[PDB]
Design a protein around this ligand. Sequence first.
Ligand code: MMC
Ligand SMILES: [Mg+2]
Ligand SMILES: [Mg+2]
Ligand SMILES: [Mg+2]
Ligand SMILES: [Mg+2]
Ligand SMILES: [Mg+2]
Ligand SMILES: [Mg+2]
Ligand SMILES: [Mg+2]
Ligand SMILES: [Mg+2]
Ligand SMILES: [Mg+2]
Ligand SMILES: [Mg+2]
Ligand SMILES: [Mg+2]
Ligand SMILES: [Mg+2]
Ligand SMILES: [Mg+2]
Ligand SMILES: [Mg+2]
Ligand SMILES: [Mg+2]
Ligand SMILES: [Mg+2]
Ligand SMILES: [Mg+2]
Ligand SMILES: [Mg+2]
Ligand SMILES: [Mg+2]
Ligand SMILES: [Mg+2]
Ligand SMILES: [Mg+2]
Ligand SMILES: [Mg+2]
Ligand SMILES: [Mg+2]
Ligand SMILES: [Mg+2]
Length: 87
Amino acid sequence: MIIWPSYIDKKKSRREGRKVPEELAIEKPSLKDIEKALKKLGLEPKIYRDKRYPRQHWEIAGRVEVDYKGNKLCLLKEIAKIIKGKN
RNA sequence: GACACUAAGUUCGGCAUCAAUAUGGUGACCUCCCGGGAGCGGGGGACCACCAGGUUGCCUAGAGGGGUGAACCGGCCCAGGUCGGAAACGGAGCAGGUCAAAACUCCCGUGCUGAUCAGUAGUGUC
Ligand code: MMC
Ligand SMILES: [Mg+2]
Ligand SMILES: [Mg+2]
Ligand SMILES: [Mg+2]
Ligand SMILES: [Mg+2]
Ligand SMILES: [Mg+2]
Ligand SMILES: [Mg+2]
Ligand SMILES: [Mg+2]
Ligand SMILES: [Mg+2]
Ligand SMILES: [Mg+2]
Ligand SMILES: [Mg+2]
Ligand SMILES: [Mg+2]
Ligand SMILES: [Mg+2]
Ligand SMILES: [Mg+2]
Ligand SMILES: [Mg+2]
Ligand SMILES: [Mg+2]
Ligand SMILES: [Mg+2]
Ligand SMILES: [Mg+2]
Ligand SMILES: [Mg+2]
Ligand SMILES: [Mg+2]
Ligand SMILES: [Mg+2]
Ligand SMILES: [Mg+2]
Ligand SMILES: [Mg+2]
Ligand SMILES: [Mg+2]
Ligand SMILES: [Mg+2]
């Protein structure tokens, strides 16, 4: 499973990446936040710093990868909820 | 005879060339879900344009015909580059073309109004 950071960015529109609802989208998603949340779910992430979402080719913001096999969306919503449980 | 008004009859300008509303199609921006290995695929929501269009009736007045570039926004095609991919291909945006539409123009038609002619049509006036 491939998790492009754009999938959870609150600053990005739907057509620009966002796969997660507005109420769950994260302010500044980072590969660590995604790696940490994924590790909190008992999974094993794999960060790839050099790789760019085609909808933002100019921007080199990595991408993580996990073996997970469930609802990609569910997983994403869940990693969004983890990232904010204490301001 | 004379003067009015009521049309119309010339001769030249000035302009206008529907408004108000349902249903349907398409499309950007936005939003939500379902699906997929990545790029992506699919369905819904709202809104605002536009193309079709049933109904309704006032504004000096189930109706047209061309055209152009180009404030801006959009379709479509399609480079180079670039990104995802083993590849097929898919993406973000440009240059390029192209269409639609904003817009502005020309034409025909129907009229309104201004002046100019003459003064026949009709009831008035003295
Ligand atoms: C993991 Hg949902
Ligand atoms: Mg909301
Ligand atoms: Mg943070
Ligand atoms: Mg789609
Ligand atoms: Mg129009
Ligand atoms: Mg028609
Ligand atoms: Mg009718
Ligand atoms: Mg009028
Ligand atoms: Mg009228
Ligand atoms: Mg009149
Ligand atoms: Mg009709
Ligand atoms: Mg655009
Ligand atoms: Mg190319
Ligand atoms: Mg191209
Ligand atoms: Mg093809
Ligand atoms: Mg494209
Ligand atoms: Mg262009
Ligand atoms: Mg050119
Ligand atoms: Mg041309
Ligand atoms: Mg037009
Ligand atoms: Mg003019
Ligand atoms: Mg004109
Ligand atoms: Mg008059
Ligand atoms: Mg007058
Ligand atoms: Mg009498």
